[PDB]
């Protein structure tokens, strides 16, 4: 519902406006740099397992800061929690926030990264190397 948004902004000061639907994911077309068993390369894929929330300034201005909450597996969910707890104290590590929110009869785990930007650096490099 709406309380999901009230959990996402968690404890800081947001002023958060949804960036899509209600409480589900949002498709985007973003440049990835991927290598595994099947696909390999630097190409524009279409990412769809995140929820985006854009931060509102005072004066109800829209500021360049997005809360990106990803919802994915449970087994992966802790591994990332452990490694974050290890690297927590670095200055360059985007502040994470791990929780579990129930939708239907499931407390599905979410991992929210805070105060990130619209475009990553892969997007800059792609846009400047494949220029049309």
Swiss-Prot record:
It catalyses: RNA(n) + a ribonucleoside 5'-triphosphate = RNA(n+1) + diphosphate; a 5'-end diphospho-ribonucleoside in mRNA + GTP + H(+) = a 5'-end (5'-triphosphoguanosine)-ribonucleoside in mRNA + diphosphate. It comes from the Viruses. This is RNA-directed RNA polymerase nsp12. Interacts with nsp7 and nsp8 to form the replication-transcription complex (RTC): nsp12, nsp7, two subunits of nsp8, and up to two subunits of nsp13. Interacts with nsp9. RNA-directed RNA polymerase that catalyzes the transcription of viral genomic and subgenomic RNAs. Acts in complex with nsp7 and nsp8 to transcribe both the minus and positive strands of genomic RNA. The kinase-like NiRAN domain of NSP12 attaches one or more nucleotides to the amino terminus of NSP9, forming a covalent RNA-protein intermediate that serves as transcription/replication primer. Its cofactor is Mg(2+). Inhibited by Remdesivir antiviral drug (GS-5734) through non-obligate RNA chain termination.
